[PDB]
Task: inverse folding
């Protein structure tokens, strides 16, 4: 029925960890066991906003819920997640994460995150595979899901030593992969155990947190993770060009988690061999302005923009570039008419080549303090 | 030789108002001057302070719904519009002038409706972004925010933003 | 699409034969007042107007109707004249025009022959956008736009980018 | 193609003034702007603050007693009235424009009575509620109280009343 | 940054909306009781924070808002509860809310001069105790005088000098 | 709520209507004698109510209203009786009355400068003792200084501290 | 000399640009604590420098600049850091920069009256300790109160009276 009048209840609330309502969209694929409580079919996507949907659509005994708690401890975002059904064979568990179009009109595994478009007008901007990115065939298809979506995917090095991770990441020369190696243990509030989380959804909520506050152009490296204890293995950052473990992991382009607990990230690079798009803040502004070309083409095709197309797209593109100069995301912005236009009948009939140059804000990596001990002001003080 | 204008086109968001835009007025660009006479002078010199505001006033003569719906939006610089013009002088060399602008459509004025005349609605946009290209290349590029007052390619506030850190 | 003067002459003859059965013959350039209740349309003057911003030339034409009647039936020709004026209040002649502006109606003295003595000039003006629009500025269609970047710039390697691409 | 108006009707409270309403003026809708130049800018951008007041000025030409009796009522928004109009353009497609309004009839002005001319009384209503439907569907819906400034269906103050609790 | 100003305003008192008659508000002027301090070995004093001072939050209405007159001079000081809402729309659309929960003594009802043809403007004032301002739902100020709560942006700025007084 | 302002005003003194010459009134500014209080274990003082202060209720007339000049400086202080009526019409028609019964000493007759071509404006002031404001006939304020009556909205706010002083 | 005025202005707080909402600044009024001194053998006192006094550097913004509200009344006084930039363009083109690094206590957040149709103007004030003004990159003022640094144009004007107090 119902109840009238106020009601006081003996209950259990576990120590509120509210965060900021972020704006970026996160894709996630991890494994759980379906039951009558978990009210979601495996290979269908569902957007989640708070922990009430990670306890009702998916079970609390899961591994999505280990990673949805990872985002919601850090930044309240919109996670579009699918479920991979539980397998036992270590290849068949990862081969169901990949999947394909084995169904009639449905993609199953990681590919089901392509249904973020045409369903909510909210594509995933981040792609997370917690723990499964240690396998190569998952991580290579994170690249194949990033090229179709313009969404940088967060990888996961193995929980073993550094040479198991540096020699793992030698086969990646892809612009959009971002690897976080050291696994994070976090003490659970029920089972009295430091749960060895895979530590790739901890960085996913951090990217949602930096976009909501400090913006996308700030490199999301020295920002503090909350709701977290130490890593599964300790790293350190000391100075003097030695074999210290943080310098050993940046030079092979892996993010690291540095201090007392799982405080901060440390990677500023992405897994690109091409040193132009080495910073993650450059690839996320490139893949943001390439989306404004798409919405600047969709807006310049539904209204019959025939004779004034290239003027409608380019000025509408510079309406977005002056926004980035306004927000501090770029320093230079210039949309150039390239001199590779050969003849007037040749260029006006086809192939008008224009450029977009922008100097992204470089994140302060390696400040340098050249320090002295002098005898200059010893005379002035004593006399 | 003087330049008689021949063709006139107005866009609002891409929709061709080529035809029924009988009158259009670009914003007069006015330097914020100040009659300044200091100690060692008698006549006042005038010093720039920036520009003053920019209103562009076109007047379409129909019940549009394609220009009416940009009044009172929650965001300024949402109405943009692109003017296109064509002055024709000096042996048929019609110079293509465009004047693309942007800003809040600050006033929609329906006139007297005396039951039988034309419509002649009136409009006024508080222009923020203003870009005037005469014969392809740039003449006036006025972005108020970010301080991008640029005359024929060179940015006259390049020395200012280095001083202000912008 | 656009109008033609021959499209204007046919529609004013068309509608006026429907509304006026007492008018026996409404021709746009006839002569010979062969019978009593005749109406002979004309053209008085075609004048400029505020030129629109396209290739159409704005023209308002003083259209003209002459109501030929033998003398002694002057009242029978005002009733023809009142039928034309009641038409011209909203009439666009079904041709994408502006509604016609009625000007005057009075008995005149023609230069022509006056066997049919009594004639009533009924003249009205309506604006015309004759001709095609003309585009002048830019003819660059949606099929031609490539948008590179700063390192992917130069005549050595082309900016390999289309504006319609992946999502 | 321009739109010549053809038909005009005015209601006051349902009573048909179809006929003797020779002139009518809808309220010009003006955004309360402000020339705003902050630190990092030179030209002033203009920022909305809401609308300013709305006066509609029709002028009937008779001693009415059906429009005179709505002057000086103890309640504002008691005079409402509904305008109906009809612009005719583009091959006889007469678009039905209505402009229903509401507010205090703030001024009744009898002109000079020079003993032989028409009447031509003049009126002015301080419009509160203003609703303009061009061709059936909504264009401008301005309710000042409750903050219901709505452009073509969407409420531009939907984000404001959630912040203010209204 | 975007140009962002005040556009509209609202006032609640014990849940009751003043959606119709508030011409003006005034948030309480938060000021530190600065005691300028020049001592031996320096010049140009350095202004040590001593704490805040009293926080009157004036506003005014011009109707017979008896639901605002009932809270003057009650036996329970700090029983006037109320928020000073207000939205800043900016330039890019979406408005940033600023609310300000108050809890104090309505220490002044100042009815204006009634000039019989002007407004009324019942000017008020609340010497608030509790004070909580929010921006876009995010916390900036917790000012509770008694029991020592000065929490700027969520972190308590008197907690180091509350576990030594033993409060 | 509805937009509601002051429109018209009236003043009675011992029943005599001033329906013809009152350009201005002023209700007495009800203010609490706030003593700001910062003590050990807090900051940002908390403003304990100590009571009200004196209540001068100015007004002005510009005629020889001798029926208002007779009440200056009599032997019986608090013998000037009078109400400050005033109606707030709102927007939806019916007007909400505000009356304010006074009882005090007319402590000031301030005749203005007589500039011979301007108004007179005999500005007055009454340091009232008794004070009762009503809104739509409903009670809001009973302020009687002597014998301890502060009754906000009908409930006595000093009755708990009147049966302990033994008044 | 050339006619040279203020044209544009900027404000940074901990690196964060206020490029969109600062209508006004105020540099701190540098004034000497002048004690006028007339003694035996003279007249018309001679105004010995005693030192400066406190340096409040007001400014105002009119948005919800929460990044400026977080620095009010922290535990660390002199933790508000910020520069008051500003360029003087002159008449002959190139602009002369004036920047002013501050370090003090944000001792006042004064939110304006919210008249619902006007601006906001959150007026602030910082009682600065450290103060460094530059002109075209050249130093003019180092004002550090503690540890005795008054360096006018780079040369220390208190160094002769700092190696005698033994600081």
Result:
């Amino acid at each position: 029925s119902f109840f009238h009048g106020v009601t006081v209840t003996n209950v259990d609330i576990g120590a509120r960890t509210i965060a900021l309502p972020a704006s970026s969209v996160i894709g996630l694929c991890d494994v759980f066991t379906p039951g009558a409580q978990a009210s979601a079919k495996p290979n269908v996507p569902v957007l989640l906003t708070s922990k009430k949907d990670a306890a009702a659509a998916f079970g609390i005994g899961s591994s999505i819920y280990l990673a949805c708690e990872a985002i919601y401890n850090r930044a309240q975002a919109v996670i579009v997640a699918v479920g991979v059904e539980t397998a036992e064979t270590p290849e068949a568990q990862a081969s169901a994460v990949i999947g394909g179009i084995s169904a009639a009109g449905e993609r199953t595994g990681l590919q089901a995150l392509l249904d973020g478009k045409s369903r909510f007008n909210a594509q995933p901007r981040l792609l997370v595979a917690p723990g499964h990115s240690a396998q190569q065939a998952v991580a290579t298809a994170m690249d194949g899901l990033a090229e179709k979506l313009r969404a940088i995917a967060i990888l996961d090095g193995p929980n073993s030593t550094d040479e198991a991770a540096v020699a793992y990441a030698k086969n990646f020369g892809s612009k959009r992969l971002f690897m976080v190696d050291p696994g994070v243990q976090v003490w659970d509030s029920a089972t009295n155990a430091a749960r060895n989380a895979p530590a790739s959804a901890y960085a996913a909520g951090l990217f949602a947190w930096t976009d909501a506050e400090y913006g996308f152009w700030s490199s999301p490296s020295n920002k503090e993770i909350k709701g977290v204890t130490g890593t599964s293995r300790p790293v350190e950052f000391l100075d003097g060009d030695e074999t210290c473990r943080a310098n050993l992991l940046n030079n092979a382009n892996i993010a690291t988690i540095i201090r007392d607990d799982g405080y901060r990230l440390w990677g500023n690079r992405t897994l690109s061999s091409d040193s132009k798009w080495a910073f993650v803040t450059r690839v996320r502004t490139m893949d943001l302005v390439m989306d404004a070309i798409l919405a600047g083409h969709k807006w310049a095709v539904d209204r019959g923009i025939t004779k004034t197309y290239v003027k409608d797209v380019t000025e509408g593109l510079r309406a977005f570039m002056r926004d980035l100069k306004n927000q501090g995301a770029v320093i230079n912005f210039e949309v150039y008419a390239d001199p590779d236009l050969n003849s007037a009948s040749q260029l006006a009939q086809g192939k008008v080549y224009w450029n977009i140059r922008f100097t992204d804000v470089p994140p302060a990596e390696n400040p340098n303090f050249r320090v002295e001990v002098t005898d200059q002001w010893l005379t002035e003080v004593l006399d | 030789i003087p330049q008689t204008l021949t063709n006139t086109n107005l866009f609002i968001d891409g929709v061709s108002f080529a035809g029924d835009v009988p009158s259009l007025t670009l914003p007069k660009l006015a330097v914020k001057t100040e009659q300044y006479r200091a100690g060692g002078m008698d006549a006042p010199v005038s010093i720039d302070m920036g520009l003053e505001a920019m209103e562009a006033k076109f007047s379409t003569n129909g019940a549009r719904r394609e220009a009416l719906n940009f009044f009172g939006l929650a965001d300024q610089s949402a109405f943009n519009g692109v003017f296109r013009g064509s002055f024709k002088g000096q042996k048929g060399a019609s110079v293509p002038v465009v004047a693309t602008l942007r800003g809040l459509l600050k006033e929609v004025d329906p006139g007297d409706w005396k039951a039988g005349e034309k419509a002649e609605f009136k409009y006024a946009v508080a222009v923020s972004y203003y870009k005037l290209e005469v014969d392809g290349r740039e003449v006036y590029e006025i972005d108020p925010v970010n301080g991008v007052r640029a005359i024929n390619g060179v940015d006259q506030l390049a020395g200012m933003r280095n001083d202000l850190g912008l | 699409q656009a109008v033609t003067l021959e499209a204007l002459y046919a529609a004013i003859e068309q509608v006026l034969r429907e509304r006026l059965p007492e008018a026996q013959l409404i021709g746009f350039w006839p002569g010979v007042p062969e019978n009593t209740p005749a109406v002979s349309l004309e053209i008085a003057e075609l004048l400029p107007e505020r030129d629109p911003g396209t290739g159409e030339s704005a023209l308002l034409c003083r259209l003209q109707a002459r109501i030929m009647v033998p003398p002694g039936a002057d009242r029978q020709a005002v009733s023809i004249a009142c039928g034309i004026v009641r038409t011209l209040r909203e009439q666009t002649w079904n041709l994408s025009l502006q509604p016609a502006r009625f000007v005057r109606s009075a008995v005149d003295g023609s230069r022509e022959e006056l066997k049919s003595l009594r004639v009533w000039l009924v003249e009205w003006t309506q604006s015309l956008r004759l001709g095609d629009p003309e585009w002048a500025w830019e003819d660059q269609p949606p099929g031609s736009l490539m948008l590179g970047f700063d390192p992917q710039t130069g005549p050595g390697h082309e900016p390999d980018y289309f504006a319609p691409e992946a999502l």
Notes: Chain G touches chain D at residues 7-11, 17-23, 117-119 (CB under 8 Å).
